[PDB]
Each structure stands twice: as structure tokens, then as C-alpha cells.
Motif scaffolding. Structure first.
Motif, mmCIF file in Angstrom:
data_model
loop_
_atom_site.group_PDB
_atom_site.id
_atom_site.type_symbol
_atom_site.label_atom_id
_atom_site.label_comp_id
_atom_site.label_asym_id
_atom_site.label_seq_id
_atom_site.Cartn_x
_atom_site.Cartn_y
_atom_site.Cartn_z
ATOM 1 N N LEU C 154 38.051 -20.204 29.395
ATOM 2 C CA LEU C 154 39.390 -19.749 28.826
ATOM 3 C C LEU C 154 40.573 -20.390 29.754
ATOM 4 O O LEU C 154 41.570 -20.838 29.137
ATOM 5 N N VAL C 155 40.428 -20.660 31.141
ATOM 6 C CA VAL C 155 41.610 -21.290 31.810
ATOM 7 C C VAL C 155 41.653 -22.615 31.381
ATOM 8 O O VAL C 155 42.648 -23.112 31.922
ATOM 9 N N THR C 156 40.620 -23.277 30.913
ATOM 10 C CA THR C 156 40.721 -24.479 30.488
ATOM 11 C C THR C 156 40.946 -24.820 29.051
ATOM 12 O O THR C 156 41.040 -26.119 28.759
ATOM 13 N N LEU C 157 41.332 -23.978 28.308
ATOM 14 C CA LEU C 157 41.521 -24.043 26.837
ATOM 15 C C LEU C 157 42.799 -24.897 26.800
ATOM 16 O O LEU C 157 43.731 -24.794 27.685
ATOM 17 N N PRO C 158 43.111 -25.649 25.879
ATOM 18 C CA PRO C 158 44.429 -26.535 25.760
ATOM 19 C C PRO C 158 45.630 -25.696 25.741
ATOM 20 O O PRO C 158 45.562 -24.545 24.846
ATOM 21 N N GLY C 159 46.614 -25.806 26.429
ATOM 22 C CA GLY C 159 47.820 -25.062 26.651
ATOM 23 C C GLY C 159 47.875 -23.958 27.441
ATOM 24 O O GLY C 159 48.847 -23.280 27.626
ATOM 25 N N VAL C 160 46.673 -23.575 28.279
ATOM 26 C CA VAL C 160 46.461 -22.846 29.326
ATOM 27 C C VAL C 160 47.099 -23.222 30.568
ATOM 28 O O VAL C 160 46.240 -24.200 30.928
ATOM 29 N N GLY C 161 47.956 -22.603 31.038
ATOM 30 C CA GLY C 161 48.529 -22.872 32.643
ATOM 31 C C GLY C 161 48.384 -21.856 33.652
ATOM 32 O O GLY C 161 49.059 -22.157 34.640
ATOM 33 N N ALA C 162 47.746 -20.924 33.261
ATOM 34 C CA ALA C 162 47.615 -19.843 34.298
ATOM 35 C C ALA C 162 46.695 -18.577 34.153
ATOM 36 O O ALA C 162 46.288 -18.549 33.155
ATOM 37 N N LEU C 163 46.315 -17.946 35.112
ATOM 38 C CA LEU C 163 45.352 -16.822 34.945
ATOM 39 C C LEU C 163 45.885 -15.656 35.741
ATOM 40 O O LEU C 163 46.264 -15.781 37.156
ATOM 41 N N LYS C 164 46.217 -14.351 35.170
ATOM 42 C CA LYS C 164 46.669 -13.293 35.886
ATOM 43 C C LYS C 164 45.198 -12.738 36.198
ATOM 44 O O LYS C 164 44.364 -12.134 35.198
ATOM 45 N N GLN C 165 44.676 -12.490 37.264
ATOM 46 C CA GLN C 165 43.662 -11.919 37.665
ATOM 47 C C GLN C 165 43.737 -10.650 38.468
ATOM 48 O O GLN C 165 43.866 -10.289 39.623
ATOM 49 N N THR C 166 43.523 -9.401 37.212
ATOM 50 C CA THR C 166 43.533 -8.232 37.728
ATOM 51 C C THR C 166 42.085 -7.807 38.082
ATOM 52 O O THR C 166 41.447 -7.083 37.240
ATOM 53 N N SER C 167 41.556 -8.160 39.008
ATOM 54 C CA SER C 167 40.309 -7.864 39.463
ATOM 55 C C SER C 167 40.025 -7.704 40.967
ATOM 56 O O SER C 167 40.846 -8.406 41.845
#
Lengths: 293, 294, 295, 296
Positions: C154-167
Motif C-alpha cells: 500500500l505505501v508503495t502504490l504510485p502516488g502514496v507519500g505517507a502512512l498514518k500508523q494508528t497501531s
């Protein structure tokens, strides 16, 4: 034939927590007298996991002396350890049991391949006695998929499955995939529904005090008397409601004590004693069951 | 009369552009009626309500009422996470002449039991007289209620039934024991027979859209004490459910209905994807089997 | 900054007695956060009570926040809905309003295949028309349990620039950082912020930042300077507050504190959220006093 | 120092021979190996020692041998926990007899015991420990016992309890426990979050991987103490690369295999149902042993 209604045997202890042989013998005869099809020995209900291997063997031997040839006998020889399980399996063979059973090894996470080899090894040591795979995710923490269950029940030497799961979709699926498989319903509180879904028998703790009711449900369904089947299950559940509140094993032992079968109604620590607030209900239940049959 | 019976959880047919296919919706309603269904549960999970706007949900309610009001029982699921939005739909269901409303326990956000109770109370108020069908479906909502909490919900003023989408048949029996007159719908199609035996007096399900008569047959068989017939029918329903779970339930059902000439375009709304083409042969054959059976 | 890394408050949505948007309070809250030195705002997510808001109401909030903070601080628009089409509509609006990025929670309620989740993000990214996507992983509320491999995809899909990790899984936090050295990674649980940064997060997004964002900025600074003790003390103070907010109800507790800070006119949340238990007012009022004096 | 239980302590493995019997020579070598890498102590008879596939006498034999090898050199904690309270009491009395510094017990598992029963279980073992502090052991992943903070608070405040081994990845709870019990000895249980666990409130740790790279964890403690966050993170990252591997290979057997290559363990087998290591992992395990020996 391993199909039927069999009681998961309790292990009576004395005030010092040691095996009460006389009460064990009395409980075996009590079950035989009420018409039980057989006994499942050394499982959860027998408090096997708070007993040593030698203690479990002692129980297996005594039960065999008391019931071999009279009713079917299944020895639950399962331990986390394969070697320990094998030792119990070999002893079960020596004592003359009709079959062995083993809960999926727990605590440590094991791969499915490891579970499979575990069963194969026990089956080898059982030297001829069929294996009853034991699926009880609630206590074991092992959650098997339908595919995995299918693989285990098809292993050479496996002749039955004790299904302690409330998933009746899976119960139906197992029956569909294995038309001739001996399938024991494990949760007493859904016995009627479990049989309708595909189980052809059952193994349960409460059978010790009212096994005839479960035999009654089998008969009712066979005759197409749904009304009677439901009434019996409802009465069984009123009892189960109580036992879950009081603590199942000690509640059952207390009822059996009031029936003069079990000398001392104690379970081994860490199981605590029954809360005295429940004695009125447990005494009344024993009286009711003695009058009933 | 009453609300007991076998009710199909209605699907919402869409066109190639993901827009409501009114013509197919009407055909599906009549198709269900012709199957002998006792009623329809509209606007729930199966109707893809959670990927529809309030206006779209109301539109479906209005149309279904036009097609079946007076012919069969109609239950409108008006549940949303929002109480106010649920109330709006409740008021509309009343306006369209539905027989009852229903609401899933609000999800996503963790709500206290007191908040869940007040939620149902507010919707019942807006339902203006229509009885409420509490909807317990922990697997999808993530809300796990205790038996005591369930007893409290089903005894709230205005509540007249409970849709129990739970595979716990011990709890099903406990509910029946505590509420002998409660309308209790079995929610999981795959255990219908066992659910009735445990205490349910009817059911609501997605697969009723393509084989409702089989479920009606199970009710009849158990009523006549024919255990084998009930089991055989359940086994047949489960062979279908096995397939539908593999293909995807809603789209699999729509695809079967398509081959039955009921649904023009068997698509679901995104993020739901299309049916894997490798499953078409099985779905077509199933459609053929069902048609020849009925 | 020319990137999305930082401490961003998850914006609350102030309502009036009728549960309708309180524009004046919203504007005040935005300015209040800017004054606290926050790096940006995450708008329209759980904390903004977006899931009890209509699409048009969510859009109204986005427009107003943009009017107030565009060009001053970073702005991330959470456009996620269960529906892909609805999420796309909000993505297009975020683009029109000039937000710096969009974000979307994994679609919930219905079980979707991983491939469906991926296509969902791709579709929203398309509608975002250039704005980078912040994948939002929050299993506790969404019910979606992704594996590490799926998160990596998911984080490497074209256009993804970040991840909010609520874990709260900080082993996974470290594994994500190890696999993606340059990924913008927001710690989602305020109560483990310091440990999350240590594990690999390079910023965070949280609800409590609204009333004490400077404490979290203080934690970032402390760790950067190697002052472990100060970082721990700050985290401890944050957790004392979090303990209270969890008892009172987080969103309403926060709004009540803001009310005493003269920011929010009516500290109400939308039903089914209930009012704060009056027995908590004394503590909440005292907390507001303390925080204001602390500034 | 004499009575302090705080620190980095390895969860000791139990070496077996080709016949699955205790390999005393390798057990002694492993104890000395841990002492030599500067470990603060050993946690014996726990999950890692394969205690649940061992008999009571076998667990006692291991306890006795470890005491002979390390008593007085490093701290020794005896995990005496069994499902049965009576068996646990037997092991506790033996631990005291052998001269251990403390005892520990996992929450009894399999059967669903009430919280009151868990409490009485600990009280009973504490009585049999006759002086040795008790280390409560919370590990929900394996035991299936999920305790609330209030319950953990009640357990760690029982008379005779001096520590808690927290095998939980919930670092909010870790901080809450530290806040409620400022003087409680709190061991981080999951090696893969050690650095973050210490930051949250833990003041030490107990772990399986300490057997092959304990100096790295001591390095993290020192790094955080000196305010060297970069070094702390670097060490944790290297530890996690190893943990990633061990989880794939099987933790206990992977560790025994590395120890075999380091010439400590004669035969790296675990007891059945544990299977052998898949040969496809041997290259990485051998390379890891070489790297660790070079590093040390």
C-alpha cells in the motif's frame, strides 16, 4: 462402533487433593447405570492438565478395570509433549481402551505440519486403537481451518473427531465432506442443534448428571419429535446456565456429592471451592435429578 | 398480524454506471414475492446501504413500498452511524408505509452501551409507531454485546424483534428462553435449520433472493417433524453458500439473478470488485438448477 | 518545510447546541492550533467526527480550514469513506481547496479483499489529481487487519507519500521504517508517541494535540537533542491527560477543555455520542487552567 | 546490588541430546556463555526452557545445575509456574533450596480461571517461595489470559511480589504500570521493542534472543542512559533483523542452531512436537553465528 453419547469423566479427589479411588469407581458405575454409551477419560473434564502422567495413567487403569467390555472407553492421552502423549497412548492400549484422543498441543505455537506429525506419532504408539482428533479452540487457542480439519481427520488411524466448536456451519461442512465420520458434538448447550447440523453423537461434562436427557434428544430427533427435543435441550441449558455460574467441574462434583456418588466435591488448585451462595440451587438440582431418573 | 417469518435481505441492482437500476429493483421485489417470501428487509448490509447516500436509501425504500406494500411484510433498515441520519430514514419509512424499522448497532466509533440504548430510543421516536427490529451483527459492526445487554435492548419501549446474525446457538436459545414472545430472526443462512431448532422463529438472509422457497421448505419440514427433509434442504443451501463465499456473496447473488433474467447488470458498488470470470460457469449452472427446481 | 513530516493535530469539528457546524469556533480552533506551533492539521478524520457527518458537511469543513490555514501550515484532508465514489468526491474538493495531501482509512464494515483495498486507494489518488496520499492504518476502529507485506504494498502504490500508523505494535513500526527509509510515518496513538518516534516514526497525528500540541513538539525536540528524561516526563504528562480523556470520552473531553480555554462555544459531539458526565467538569476545567498557565 | 532484580536477563534455553534428553554439558556451557557476555542474570524454566514439554523432575534438574554453575555470579530467577498450584509450589520450594534469587509464575493457562483464583495461585506459590521475591508473568499471547490494568495492579501489589515480566507490546500499559508503581522492577518481554519498552517505563528485560547477543541489549540500556538515541536505534534495528529471521526459522530452534555454530550447544534440537529447522535457513543462521562471534 464409536458413535454415541459419551460422558467426559470427572476425576474425584479427597480433601488433600489426591485421587479418591472409591469415588472414581462409583462415578464410573453411576454412568453405566444411567445408560451412557461410553466414557471419555483424561480430558479437560478429568482435570488432566493439573495431573501428572502417572496420575492420568492411574485413572485410565482404574476406569478400564471398572468398565472395559461394558461400555466404550476413549482415553484422552493428549499433552503438549508428543513423547508424553505417546506414553499415555501405549498405556491406554495396555489397559484395553477402545480408542485414544488428543487435544491439539497448546501454549507454544506449532505449525500445522507439526500438529499432523504429533497425531501420527501418537497413532503409532496407540498400536491399533483409532484416534479421536480433538478440536477445542476456546481452551487450546489453536484455530484450525476447515481444510486443516479435513486433513487431520483423513490421517491414517483417525476414526473420529470431537468437535468442541459452536460453529454449526463448519459442523455441517465436516459432515458433508465426511459422510461416515464419527462426529461428536462438544458443547452440551447446543447438542440438539449440533446433531441437526451433522454430528452423530456427543461427548460432554454434564452427561455425568443427566446423560439420559441427551439420549432423549437423540431419540426425539430420530422420531421427528422436535417439541420434545427442544424441551429437553432447554432443561439442559437451564442447568448449564447454573454450572457456568458456579464453575462447571466443581458444580458437577457438588451435584454428584449430594447424590452420594462423590465423597468430596473439590477440584484441584487453582480451581477454587464453590461459592456457598449456589448450594441451595445445586442441592435442589440434585434432588430434582434423582427424582427424575 | 405479526412480523414472524422468512424475510429476504434485498439486494440493490445497479446499472453500468453504479446508479440505481429501478427496473431491476422492481423485478427483484416481484421475483421475491413470487417465491413465496413472507417479506423483505430493505436497506441493510445486503442492499449495499453503507455505500449509498441517505437520499439513495430513501429512494429504494419508496420504490420497494410501491411494489410490495400490502402484499408482504416490509422492514426498513434505517441504521447509520449517525443517530440524526438514522432518524431521517426512520421518518421516511413511516411515510412510505413500512411495517417496521431496524438499525444495526452504530459502528466504527466505540460507543458505550448507554449510548447504544439512547440511539435506539431516538430512532424509535422518529419511527413514529413502527416497531424496531434490533440488529445484532458483531462480525461486521465490531460491537460485541453481552446477553444482559441484548436483553435490555430487546425490551426497550417500541422494540418488537431482534435480527440475530450470530452463530452462537446457545445464546439463541437463551434469548428465546428469556423472551418467549419475541420475534427472533436467524441471521446466518448457513445454520438456518439449527437456528430455528435453537429458538429462532424465522429468518432474514441474503441468499433468500435466489432460493427463498428452500428456507420456507425447512420451516415446513421442521413444523411437520421431518428432520431428514430439513437437513437435506439445509445441505443444499450450504452447497450454494460455499460457492457464494468463494465468488463474493452480493455479486455472486446478483450474477445468478442476472442469469435468471431478473437483474440487468450484476455489479456492486466500489470498492466491491467484479466477479472473477472463472466462476461464471458455476453461477450460470446454479441459476439453471434453481430455475428447474422452482 | 518542503515535506509532510511533522506533528499534525487531528482537528475536531465544533458544533452548536443544534449539533450544526459552529463556524466561528472552527476558525478559532484552527488559529489556536497555529498559535501552538503545530506543523499542520489532519482534517475530516475520526476526530472531526466525519463518520457522523454528510459528504457536504465534511466538504464545508475542508473549505473553511483552507481559508484559515492554507499557506500557513500543512493541510491533510482525510477524504475516506466506505464508498470509493464518495471518497473520490472529497479528494477532488481537497484538490480544489488547495490541500497539501489527501488521506483515506481502509474502507470498513464490509470485508473487502486486499486487491479491492488497493484499487480503492488508486481511484482516490486519481481523483486527488496530484496531491500525495497518506494511507491510514487503524485496525482498532476499521476492523481491517493488514499484514506487513500488505502495508508495504500500500505505501508503495504510485502516488502514496505517507502512512498514518494508528497501531500500538512498535515492532511493526520499526519494520516499516526499515523497509522504507524515506517514508513519512505518523505515529497514531498519542499515548506512545515518544516510543513510536524511537521505533521509527518521524512525526505524528493525534486528537490531543489540539490542547497540548507543544508537549509533543517538546518530545520531538528532546529526542533530537538526546534528552531522554525530558522526553519521558513529557510523555508521562501527556498520558495523565489521556487517562482522563478516555474516562470522560475523548472528543467531548477535548472539546470541553477547549471550551474552558475560550475556543469552543458549545463542547458537544453528535449523537450517538453523549454529553460529558458533569462529575468530570472540575477536573476538565482544572486541566484547561493548567495547560493555559503552562503556556 | 545484592538484592536488586533490575537488569537484562536471558531466558535460558534447555539443550537436549539426540535422544531429546537433557544435555548437561551444553547446559553448563550455555550458562557460562551467558555469564561471559555480561548478562545480569538468567530466567530459568520458562517458555524458552521448553518447560511445558518437561516433567517436574526435569525442570528441577535444570534449576539445580544452573545454580551450581552461576549462583553468586549473576542473578537467578526460577520460573516455577505450572497450571497446577501444587506442582508450582513444589518447584518454588526447590528453587529456594537451590539458592535462587527469585521465583516466577506464568498465569495458569488452558482452563478459564477467575481473577480471584489467579490471585490465590500467586499467594500460594509465594508462601512456598519462603522469602524469594515473586515475578508475576503476564504473557497473553501464549497463556490466553487477558488481564486488565486494575488486575495487573492488584497482582503486583500482592505481598511478596517484587517484579513483573511484561510480555506485551502495549506500551501505553507499560507506561501506566510504571506510573502506578514507581519502584516496581519491570521487565520488557518482547525483545523486538526493547528500546521503546525501556523508554515507556521498563527498567530492564528478559528475553530468548539474549542468549546469542545479550551485549546488544546491554548496549541499548547504556545508549539510552547516555542519551545516544542513534546508537540505541541502530542496535534495536540489528536485533530486529535477527528476530525477523528467528520468527521465520522458529525461535528456540533457531537460537539453539546459532549456539551450535558458536560451539556452545552440541545438538540444536527442541522436543517434539517442535520440528527441526528447515535446511533452507541454515545459510543465514551460520552467517549470523559468524557475525555475532566476530562482533563479540
Amino acid at each position: 462402533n464409536l458413535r454415541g453419547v459419551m460422558a467426559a469423566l470427572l476425576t474425584p479427589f479427597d480433601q488433600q487433593q489426591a485421587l479418591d479411588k472409591a469415588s472414581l469407581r462409583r462415578l464410573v458405575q453411576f454412568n453405566i447405570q444411567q445408560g451412557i454409551d461410553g466414557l471419555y477419560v483424561g480430558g479437560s473434564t478429568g482435570e488432566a492438565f493439573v495431573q501428572s502422567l502417572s496420575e492420568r495413567e492411574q485413572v485410565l487403569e482404574i476406569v478400564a478395570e471398572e468398565a472395559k467390555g461394558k461400555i466404550k472407553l476413549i482415553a484422552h492421552v493428549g499433552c503438549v509433549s508428543t513423547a508424553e502423549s505417546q506414553q499415555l497412548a501405549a498405556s491406554a492400549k495396555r489397559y484395553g481402551f477402545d480408542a485414544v484422543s488428543a487435544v491439539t498441543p497448546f501454549y507454544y505455537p506449532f505449525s500445522f505440519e507439526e500438529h499432523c506429525d504429533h497425531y501420527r506419532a501418537i497413532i503409532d504408539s496407540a498400536d491399533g486403537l483409532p484416534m479421536v482428533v480433538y478440536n477445542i479452540p476456546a481452551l487450546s487457542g489453536v484455530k484450525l481451518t476447515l481444510d486443516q480439519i479435513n486433513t487431520l481427520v483423513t490421517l491414517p488411524g483417525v476414526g473420529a473427531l470431537k468437535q468442541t466448536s459452536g460453529d454449526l456451519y463448519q459442523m455441517e461442512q465436516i459432515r458433508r465432506e465426511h459422510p461416515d465420520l464419527v462426529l461428536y458434538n462438544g458443547y452440551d448447550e447446543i447438542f440438539a442443534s449440533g446433531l441437526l447440523a451433522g454430528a452423530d453423537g456427543g461427548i460432554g461434562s454434564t452427561y455425568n448428571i443427566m446423560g439420559w436427557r441427551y439420549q432423549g434428544i437423540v431419540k426425539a430427533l430420530k422420531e421427528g419429535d422436535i417439541q420434545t427435543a427442544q424441551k429437553l435441550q432447554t432443561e439442559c441449558n437451564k442447568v448449564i446456565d447454573l454450572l457456568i455460574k458456579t464453575g462447571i467441574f466443581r458444580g458437577l462434583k457438588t451435584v454428584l456429592h449430594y447424590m452420594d456418588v462423590v465423597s468430596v466435591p473439590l477440584c484441584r488448585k487453582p480451581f477454587g471451592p464453590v461459592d456457598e451462595k449456589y448450594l441451595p440451587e445445586l442441592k435442589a438440582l440434585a434432588q430434582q435429578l434423582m427424582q427424575e431418573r
